Amino acid sequence: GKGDRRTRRGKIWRGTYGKYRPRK
Amino acid sequence: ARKALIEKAKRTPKFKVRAYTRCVRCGRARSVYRFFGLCRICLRELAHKGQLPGVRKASW
Amino acid sequence: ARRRRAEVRQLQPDLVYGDVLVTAFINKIMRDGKKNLAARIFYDACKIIQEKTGQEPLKVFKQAVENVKPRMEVRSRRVGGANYQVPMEVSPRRQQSLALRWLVQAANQRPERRAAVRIAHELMDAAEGKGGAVKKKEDVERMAEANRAYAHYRW
Amino acid sequence: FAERQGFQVEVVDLTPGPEAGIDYAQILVKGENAYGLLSPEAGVHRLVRPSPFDASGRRHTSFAGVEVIPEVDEEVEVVLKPEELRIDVMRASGPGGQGVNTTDSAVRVVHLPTGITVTCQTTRSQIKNKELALKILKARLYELERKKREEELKALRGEVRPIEWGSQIRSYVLDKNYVKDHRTGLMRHDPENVLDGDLMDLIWAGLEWKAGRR
Amino acid sequence: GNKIHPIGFRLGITRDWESRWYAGKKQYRHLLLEDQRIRGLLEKELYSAGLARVDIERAADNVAVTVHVAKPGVVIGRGGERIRVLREELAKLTGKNVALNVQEVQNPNLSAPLVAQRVAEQIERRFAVRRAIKQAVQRVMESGAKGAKVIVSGRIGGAEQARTEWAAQGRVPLHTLRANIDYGFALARTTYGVLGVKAYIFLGEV
RNA sequence: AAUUCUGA
RNA sequence: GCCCGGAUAGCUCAGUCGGUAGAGCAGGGGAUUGAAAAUCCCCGUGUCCUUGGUUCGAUUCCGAGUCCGGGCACCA
RNA sequence: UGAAACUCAAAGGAAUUGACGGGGGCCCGCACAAGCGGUGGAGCAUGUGGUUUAAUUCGAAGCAACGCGAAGAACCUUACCAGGCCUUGACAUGCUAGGGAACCCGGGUGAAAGCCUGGGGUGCCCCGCGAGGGGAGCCCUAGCACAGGUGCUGCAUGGCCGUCGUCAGCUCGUGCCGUGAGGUGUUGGGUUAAGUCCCGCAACGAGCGCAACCCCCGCCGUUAGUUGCCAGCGGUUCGGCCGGGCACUCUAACGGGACUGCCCGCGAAAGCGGGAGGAAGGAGGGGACGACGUCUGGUCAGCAUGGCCCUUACGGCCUGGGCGACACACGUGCUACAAUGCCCACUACAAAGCGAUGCCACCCGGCAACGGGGAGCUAAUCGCAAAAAGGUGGGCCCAGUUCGGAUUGGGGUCUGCAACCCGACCCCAUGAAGCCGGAAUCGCUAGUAAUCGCGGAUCAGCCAUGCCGCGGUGAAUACG
Ligand SMILES: [Mg+2]
Ligand SMILES: [Mg+2]
Ligand SMILES: [Zn+2]
């Protein structure tokens, strides 16, 4: 969910980038 | 703690972290737009008097 | 709504069946205004119809939605210290709204894990006069008539 | 205040009531030299502030009394040894037979250091009547020997308790914000601060004004 | 606690600014602050003239100081000694060319800031405020106008029960834009409180 | 068919 | 002094063939009302007087004591 | 039949204007109904009471206090406590004395503040090359008048803001009626959102109100063309990329048009219903604007200022602690209990704003956060930037789980002198309660409710789930 820091929306709602949302 | 405070708001001693904004009309420390450099009160009172270049009440 | 008699918003004709009602039914299945992920389910049900009865999901609608329309329900009133919940006729307009609603709720009750299955099945049992939505229909009609004692209260 | 100085509290009694406030509050505070510290704060304390229990918010005044009494005597024992008692045995009166005439049934227990005399004739024996007359003399004593611990203690407290308008020892007003000690004459300006336990100073002064006239 | 300033509400159209000059987000702060230090210094040495306005234009590294007044005199002196020592005090802290100017006000009664300072003085000189207002207003409408309005806050006469004497004449639709209404606000400073006065002078239209 | 608000 | 009955939540009372501790009020939290009371939801709450015995183990069944409420203390 | 003692500064009649009514009549607002999603249950974020601590600075208190001051508390901020120091003081003016008069640079002890201590040397008015000092900026020690206070008083005050209330109201001038307070105007009749208007009327006008005049959005045009374009074709390696072109799109400036003007129905009119024409009707949808006034509301802690109080400390500086404290209790919010779902891979459509010791194209290392290089951008021309849900196809298959992510253990990056208190992110492992929530209770009548994402402000970074804007999809019900 929008709080699961290890997924897609996890970072969308967060506003960051990580292993679970590389830079395109 | 107001006058003796702006007398610490003028300089930029040790480190920059302690460099903090401050209104010019008064000693306001909160809600100060680096741009104008004035607090929201002075800012409002001036924008009202007209002493502000190109500022005008929005509307949409 | 004390001045104007409000206004009956218009339903845009369907975009497959062309029914101003086949949409009113999807609208109730629309959570968060996602009409695409809603109409999809509905259309996936119509395929469960044509895949479990040659009957084209059209008469399975004009029938299941007609066998659910409550003729009269109960609308409470209070003359002054009177806990009388008077029974009375239903506006043709209202009827539809009450129907469709009970249809979705009922659908959302069945044990079918998918979705369209539930809508399809509930539509079958309701056309075939035996669906949870009709259970609420008779349940409502029991309250009604059973209180014809308050017939002089048709406000 | 008694939790800052280090003393220990015992809430012997506290009781609510109808709308809002408190009906009766009786507390026991210990620690070395405690009475001497809360003895000056014995009177009626006046308050003047905007009334919260009013619609207009009018400025109102409130009075409340504070009494102080140390914990001295505690035991409860009155063993009247038959050392000061003069028991008499007079002949029974009333019905009976030969035995009421000839047997010294009636008994009179006389309390010599007081003057009170109890008698008994209920039964037909002397040893059960002098013992029944002591179960009565002990009772009437247990009320007239405690009535004096209530009359030696109703003038031992003092006098300042009218609670009326004009009998105040200290005035607390949050309107203009100040505390007025009517004994010494001092006028402190921290009322919301005195309502936290800072009393050492006005107790310092109340123990000079009080024990300065004797 | 309603009503909003009638100036910042007319700025757009009706009433013009009082300091127009584009600027970049890196100077505006320092420059805008300059204008204030100017209205601050012009505040003191000039009150004897009736500084009913101070328009300041600036193209770059210059200044268009224009002090409108209804009675110049003391502004210059009698040739060019004061207005000269003012450009002196000015540039004595302003790195630009203080291009000063001075307008005149024909009808000083139809200028709010003026009528404001006016009454603001009749107050400090212990006058029947109940009168001074009905008299200052009985000055405008006669000396040509369509609406007039003055307001004085609590402490009139010194009574602790702070009042607020109203008093207006003519017409004063603060809601109607096409009208142009002069607004003023002076501050009497007495021994007790610190009164406040507002001036509302109605003028043109279209 | 549902009580009360002291005293600047 | 003899005979009979009792004490159990802070208050007033029920209860078990011995193994389960209960009711109303009070008290605490929340809710309503501007705020009180009334009303509504949510809970907790005990060496079953002390001292012994039988029993596998007792609030209950016997022994002792302390207090309480009654009835008895007549013939001379 | 019928007193007194004592006691009070009134008890009382009628008649105004109001307020109130569990009185009546007519007519409104998401006020109820109608209808959808939420709170109160769980975990957590934030604010508050309480409690505790040496201090947990302060205020705000029903609606109209509580994600409110606070639109950026690690020292700073900072106003609180513990501790170290400074007192002509950090600042404004001015006076007096010999120093000293722009001035820049070390050492020492201490945690730092501060105290001590070591040097170049001061243009200048200028008798005067000069010994000297008059000397103006002006720094240092001593002295005086003073400076300082976020200490109190928001029922001493200004100014500003909240609420009744976006309510339909409130007044004045003259006349008349009433002894007067006061009413009539401002009632009744009809209409409208409206004291808007129409008709009568001892009234006639007028003022503050609403409206309109202001901006945004929709339809159209004129002028404008480095945004846009095979609408036309050209070459086009194929990206409007080229030249070339203003017809579109758009950008911003000035105008038109809607007004119940036209038909018909009703009415005396005002006005209402419906129909057409029109992109648009009977205030088309939003703003901005919020009357005489109420609340001794709040705000001396934004500023100012009356008055009281301290002035080698109630002032000034400093390292550090505290505002973040938790057995409890209330409010606003975030993430959830799931299949109209979650996770995984691939591909598309916006708008509004914002960027030089600033936003960062693209490579290389590291799974990553992040680090090197470096180009472009003063920005309708480059970047922040991928929008997300969705469309799409592959696996989970109903178990507290591939749901949900609290807590805890280990490892790192980045600002910042410095992350124990007390920061934000990265990876691994931990996977607690929650299965739609008692009594009660919140918002909304349309592109609204719901859902989804983007930007800005403050700011080194950020506890921002808060606030102000922007856009994608897009409902149900209203009898009364
Ligand atoms: Mg009572
Ligand atoms: Mg509405
Ligand atoms: Zn300010």
PDB file of C-alpha atoms in Angstrom, chain B residues 24 34-38 46-57, chain E residues 5 7-8 11-12 17-22 25 28-29 32-33 36 39:
ATOM      1  CA  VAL B  24      12.762  44.139   8.080  1.00  0.00           C
ATOM      2  CA  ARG B  34      13.317  35.381   1.447  1.00  0.00           C
ATOM      3  CA  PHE B  35      12.116  37.196  -1.691  1.00  0.00           C
ATOM      4  CA  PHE B  36      10.596  40.353  -0.205  1.00  0.00           C
ATOM      5  CA  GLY B  37      12.332  39.775   3.131  1.00  0.00           C
ATOM      6  CA  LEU B  38       9.253  40.891   5.090  1.00  0.00           C
ATOM      7  CA  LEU B  46       2.307  47.128   2.366  1.00  0.00           C
ATOM      8  CA  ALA B  47       0.646  45.253  -0.499  1.00  0.00           C
ATOM      9  CA  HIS B  48      -2.479  47.065   0.744  1.00  0.00           C
ATOM     10  CA  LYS B  49      -0.987  50.580   0.815  1.00  0.00           C
ATOM     11  CA  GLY B  50       0.255  50.117  -2.747  1.00  0.00           C
ATOM     12  CA  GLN B  51       3.942  50.616  -1.864  1.00  0.00           C
ATOM     13  CA  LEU B  52       4.546  47.272  -3.596  1.00  0.00           C
ATOM     14  CA  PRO B  53       5.568  47.303  -7.273  1.00  0.00           C
ATOM     15  CA  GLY B  54       3.175  45.348  -9.450  1.00  0.00           C
ATOM     16  CA  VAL B  55       1.465  43.588  -6.551  1.00  0.00           C
ATOM     17  CA  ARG B  56      -2.328  43.438  -6.657  1.00  0.00           C
ATOM     18  CA  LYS B  57      -5.157  41.348  -5.244  1.00  0.00           C
TER      19      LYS B  57
ATOM     20  CA  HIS E   5      -8.572  48.223   3.160  1.00  0.00           C
ATOM     21  CA  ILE E   7      -6.719  50.898  -1.310  1.00  0.00           C
ATOM     22  CA  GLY E   8      -5.431  47.380  -1.927  1.00  0.00           C
ATOM     23  CA  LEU E  11      -4.987  49.137  -6.828  1.00  0.00           C
ATOM     24  CA  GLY E  12      -5.803  47.141  -9.969  1.00  0.00           C
ATOM     25  CA  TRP E  17       0.102  52.639  -6.950  1.00  0.00           C
ATOM     26  CA  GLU E  18       2.522  54.698  -4.870  1.00  0.00           C
ATOM     27  CA  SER E  19       5.844  53.072  -5.929  1.00  0.00           C
ATOM     28  CA  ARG E  20       6.019  51.465  -9.394  1.00  0.00           C
ATOM     29  CA  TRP E  21       9.308  49.909 -10.577  1.00  0.00           C
ATOM     30  CA  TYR E  22       9.916  46.360 -11.890  1.00  0.00           C
ATOM     31  CA  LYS E  25      13.938  38.517  -7.275  1.00  0.00           C
ATOM     32  CA  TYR E  28      13.599  43.615  -4.946  1.00  0.00           C
ATOM     33  CA  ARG E  29      14.372  42.863  -1.290  1.00  0.00           C
ATOM     34  CA  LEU E  32      12.029  47.629  -1.632  1.00  0.00           C
ATOM     35  CA  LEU E  33      13.778  48.040   1.728  1.00  0.00           C
ATOM     36  CA  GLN E  36      10.957  52.125   3.226  1.00  0.00           C
ATOM     37  CA  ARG E  39       9.508  56.839   3.647  1.00  0.00           C
TER      38      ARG E  39
END
